[PDB]
Ligand binder design. Structure first.
Ligand SMILES: Nc1ncnc2c1ncn2[C@@H]1O[C@H](COP(=O)(O)OP(=O)(O)O)[C@@H](O)[C@H]1O
Ligand SMILES: Nc1ncnc2c1ncn2[C@@H]1O[C@H](COP(=O)(O)OP(=O)(O)O)[C@@H](O)[C@H]1O
Ligand SMILES: Nc1ncnc2c1ncn2[C@@H]1O[C@H](COP(=O)(O)OP(=O)(O)O)[C@@H](O)[C@H]1O
Lengths: 370, 59, 59, 370, 370
């Protein structure tokens, strides 16, 4: 019997069947509730909208993500999203499919415990399993050695792997991702006149970020160039007309990944944390780590991010080793692709947490053996 | 609007191609500096090996 | 009219920048094989110098 | 030579001399133009009236504010208001006095650029400077540490300061203020029969707001009490007779500051944005921020606003901290008072933007250094 | 004239006067620099704060230790810290006092060379001297024979002494200490939901470590007990409210000293390195070494560390010899106490490196004879 892969993420649910080449359903991980009154008697007012139905009724709803920083902070909304995913998007019965969920490293135990309890109780999955997004990204990249940089909507984390062995003492987790860049852009756009304060307007700004933003190879002279000429200005059209034009914001937004002080964080840029996670590994494997930087997630999709990353790590590392940034063209779905590859393996069919094991051991079985 | 979207894909290709052009230009200049360094180093090695050859043939 | 002329300019930029990428990557890889053989030459020079040091320490 | 302080604001101009204890001129920031015919030949018709001359002739004028939400949206009217302030109210020559203007945080750059260009060109000030309202309010409060909630006629903003260091990533700016409360009261008075639609009638309603409105400590039981008895009803007399009496409108109007959904906004109340701006700061300084909430501006002048604020923040913060709302009795002029203190400091006389620096650098000098 | 004792260490500066009973000044070895903007014109912004003044402005500064693993890696900051120690804490003139500095064994020569050069040049001390921390700890313990385990904030090392003779081939230096336990605790606290990422938050976690952690006599059944009941849970209160509760972390943190594989290190526990350093000595003196294990430094202050150490060494050693862990109640200052004793000895006054000796022989004099 086939299995389900349900890479949750803090910004996008990607679900599908173990064995395919791409997720079958990809929709925002969002739940909307109406703000306003409701007058037309008989319109059939729903209590709440999920997925991308909440994205089209966006104008009258207040949207809420039930996942903040890789941590599920609203379990009712997460249950709504899972119910939607199973019944309306995939159109299956969760009682007839093992489920491969996914989680970021270094987040509380209660997350996985509640996740597996929810599955086994209110969905009656035959078995389940909770993988780590970085390992799956490596599976999809077709490697067994490398340091991945997964950067989704909520959390950015490096995981160095060698010969299929993880170095858990060198895992470095950072907490700025797509959403903090969206907020920084919402703030930077006010200094040009435009004001976005609503959640719907945050979705509009996310789309602006996905369309017009790129990473400058050299931030300083790029800034000076944008100040000198006006060839970097693009125009965008909000969904009511009202064309807006942005200049240096285009690269000032994703530059926060390399100077997290722009949003008042004390951490280091992604290049520096990658280099530190490398320099935290044994001296023999780091030459092979230097040449297998695997980029993953949506936030690594900016134009010119691989070039800037390679330049920075080259400036940091010794002047002899070969830095290679591996950025696939479909890197946005690497976690799901690797999850399907993993759940399709024959030798994996013994790693599921069967329902009987849970019935014997409680929800604590999850991090106990699996 | 078709013309618009074609022009958009065009300018996208233009931007990415110019970015990789500048990266590759810096790469070529760095490679040339590297060639200069290697010429210097082979020169020094020739000098030292020749001095040792002189001493060895002398003794 | 503006879309036609902008797309033509984008096309000619595509073409020139594509040929420039071609020539740049070729000259780069050729200079890099030059670098490669110079590094191997550094190796041979250092080895023969070590050999002469051996002969000098012997006699 | 003495300097001028010109706290502009979106509802009231407060100007004076650096070194005084209170603004020398306080008049409405308004420009009126005649709408009717004009028949008496030789009456000496003026084209437009500014300040409080336009307030006494308001029966025949159409009033306009050249500042909407902290942003100057009519530069001719603003130039008229500045010309008035300098020549008719203060009665000085702007060519002989450095001028300290003031601005709200997180508003477009063109605002400050046009401010400084106007000053230096059409007034020939020797030097100028553009401060932030919350910093000056903290100067006037006699502190160097605290989160200041400024609420004037156009915009409400929090700025947390610690030891004289601003936390620009925790600044939160909200766009409901006195004027939106005036409009909400104009809309709520219709359900008793009173109809104010004119701009002059908007001024009348503003005065009703300033005289009869207060913040209820507990909104729900106050509502039930107003419904039960009639002891909350006061009476107001319009300037033609016609006594009107209002009931629960008295506290329903300023309650919008704590439930901005009443005017169809999605934001949170001022208490919740204050708490959020605190919780966005480093865990070590927020215990000292909790005890230095500095209220400022005219919209914070309702009776009972400090107690409601303290109750709400206390209910939000941990049960060990000491919440202290600092609300001076003169808090309506704190920005101007602090501005005079600042412009009087001897160490400040190097921070002016001299005419020569502008002549070298263009209008962009203002935010680029100062 | 009296002499100065300046036990540096990597976490705490301990200074005083030769002859006293305890260090006169004890403050963190920290140099802080502001991160944020600074808006209060005239507040008198210092460039950098040192010592425990940087500990009170903690919330706005980014702290840096200039000593990483017993090795001074930032010489300007170390000079700042020494300047502070001499002028603001001790309030003396360094030109009138020989200075007894202290260093860990088996660290680079350039360390001592730069130390003596700094002293003699930018402080003009009449003489100076660099001791070994373990020897001074033995002086303070009132012995001439024993194997002393010193464990501060950067480095753990064993030095076996017999009849006042050192066994330099049996010195074993390990590189995990208080700071690595602090980092491991910062990592383990994430699995309960608490997130500490900043340097200030690192100081908070260090305080949690010093207040709540202890060494379990038997790790495995202690773990099982903590899983069974909830009697091991204490509650700590962050400096903004926000009570937190930790369970098995209390003893999982200091257990890393006995299983350094928890942080991904290959070394052996402190008990096993102690036993190895003993077995590397001549067969005659190890019977007396087994009975004179002298603990020293801050990291040896956990409750229950002496009992666990005795149990482990007893299980390792032959079943006849008498293991004896000597753990004074003031062991945190043993190095300084012994340094004061040593500098007070009359026969020691010939071992100082006079300024003239340095003026002749350069900085390299330090390890030539002293
Ligand atoms: N083409 C793009 N360019 C830049 N950013 C993007 C792009 N596509 C998506 N993003 C960002 O990536 C985020 C979604 O990434 P995703 O990998 O789905 O996150 P998650 O794995 O947490 O669901 C969004 O917040 C968006 O801002
Ligand atoms: N006593 C009062 N009670 C309630 N509201 C007041 C009072 N005085 C002034 N206001 C409100 O404050 C606003 C003016 O405040 P002010 O601080 O001058 O704003 P600005 O700084 O923008 O000029 C007016 O819109 C008015 O509604
Ligand atoms: N009571 C305590 N319990 C456990 N650990 C402690 C205690 N006091 C201090 N420490 C640890 O000891 C370290 C400081 O020890 P110290 O002897 O000052 O080191 P150094 O000599 O290198 O400065 C701190 O990092 C702290 O983690």
């Amino acid at each position: 019997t086939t299995a389900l892969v349900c890479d949750n993420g803090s910004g996008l649910v990607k679900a599908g069947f173990a064995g395919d080449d791409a997720p079958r359903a990809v929709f925002p991980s969002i739940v909307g509730r109406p703000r306003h009154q409701g007058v037309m008697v008989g319109m059939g007012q729903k209590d709440s909208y999920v997925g991308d139905e909440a994205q089209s009724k966006r104008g009258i709803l207040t949207l809420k993500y039930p996942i903040e920083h890789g941590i599920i902070t609203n379990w009712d909304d997460m249950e709504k999203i899972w119910h939607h995913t199973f019944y309306n998007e995939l159109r299956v019965a969760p009682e007839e499919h093992p489920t491969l969920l996914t989680e970021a490293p270094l987040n509380p135990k209660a997350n996985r415990e509640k996740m597996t309890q929810i599955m086994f109780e209110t969905f009656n999955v035959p078995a389940m399993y909770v993988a780590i997004q970085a390992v799956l990204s490596l599976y999809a990249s077709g490697r067994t050695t490398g340091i991945v940089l997964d950067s989704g909507d909520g959390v950015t984390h490096n995981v160095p792997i060698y010969e299929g062995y993880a170095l858990p003492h060198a895992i470095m987790r950072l907490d700025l991702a797509g959403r903090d860049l969206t907020d920084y852009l919402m703030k930077i756009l006010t200094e040009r006149g435009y004001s976005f304060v609503t959640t719907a307007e945050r979705e509009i700004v996310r789309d602006i970020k996905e369309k017009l933003c790129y990473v400058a190879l050299d931030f300083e002279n790029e800034m000076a160039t944008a100040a000198s000429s006006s060839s970097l200005e693009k125009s965008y059209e909000l969904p009511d007309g009202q064309v807006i034009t942005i200049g240096n914001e285009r690269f000032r937004c994703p530059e926060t990944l390399f100077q997290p002080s722009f949003i008042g964080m004390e951490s280091a840029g992604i290049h520096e944390t990658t280099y530190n996670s490398i320099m935290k590994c044994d001296i023999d494997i780091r030459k092979d780590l230097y040449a297998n930087n695997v980029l993953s997630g949506g936030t690594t999709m900016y134009p010119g991010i691989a070039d800037r990353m390679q330049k920075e790590i080259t400036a940091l590392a010794p002047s002899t080793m070969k830095i290679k940034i591996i950025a696939p063209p479909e890197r946005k779905y690497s976690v799901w692709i690797g999850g399907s590859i993993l759940a399709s393996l024959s030798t994996f069919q013994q790693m599921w947490i069967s329902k009987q094991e849970y019935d014997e051991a409680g929800p604590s079985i999850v991090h106990r053996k699996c | 609007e078709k013309y618009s979207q074609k022009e958009d894909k065009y300018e996208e290709e233009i931007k990415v191609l110019s970015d990789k052009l500048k990266e590759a230009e810096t790469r070529a200049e760095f490679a040339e500096r590297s060639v200069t360094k290697l010429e210097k180093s082979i020169d020094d090695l020739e000098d030292e090996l020749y001095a040792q050859k002189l001493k060895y043939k002398a003794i």
